[PDB]
């Protein structure tokens, strides 16, 4: 029996690229754990992946976790590209490499540690969680503390 976990994440970005933040929720037994950081320049999709990926190194043992989120990049990432990029070395079909691919190879190292259960969700009408993850992101990009080293300008 695995350590049971529920994972909540959503991002928030101010402009394309603009100031930004994460913000995870990481509910077990009952202690609730928050993470949330902002950068000044990054994209909205590269901070639905940061906070995946915060909240998951967060796991000191193999779990299985529960994630939800309504990041339709994420979702089109975990369930349409990824096994893509596995086969192809993470490059496209035109041998080019993947945007994001230090967040989406540092995702796919973390998710390989637990059993993961996606819950899609439509929107944060109805889901608190990650009505709050939300919330916690946007404070985060509105009091930005970081640099997103790895974000490629595009500008
Ligand atoms: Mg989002
Ligand atoms: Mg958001």
Known sequence: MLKQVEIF????????????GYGAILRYRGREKTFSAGYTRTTNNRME?????????????????????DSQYVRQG???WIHNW??????????????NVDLWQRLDAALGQHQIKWEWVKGHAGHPENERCDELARAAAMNPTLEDTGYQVEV
Request: aromatic share 2%; net charge positive.
């Open 9 to 20: 994440t959503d991002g928030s970005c101010l402009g394309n690229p603009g100031p930004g």
């Open 49 to 69: 992946l940061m906070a995946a990926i915060v909240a998951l190194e967060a796991l000191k043992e193999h779990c299985e976790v529960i994630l939800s989120t």
């Open 78 to 80: 975990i369930t349409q």
């Open 86 to 99: 596995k086969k192809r070395g993470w490059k496209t079909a035109d041998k080019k490499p993947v945007k």
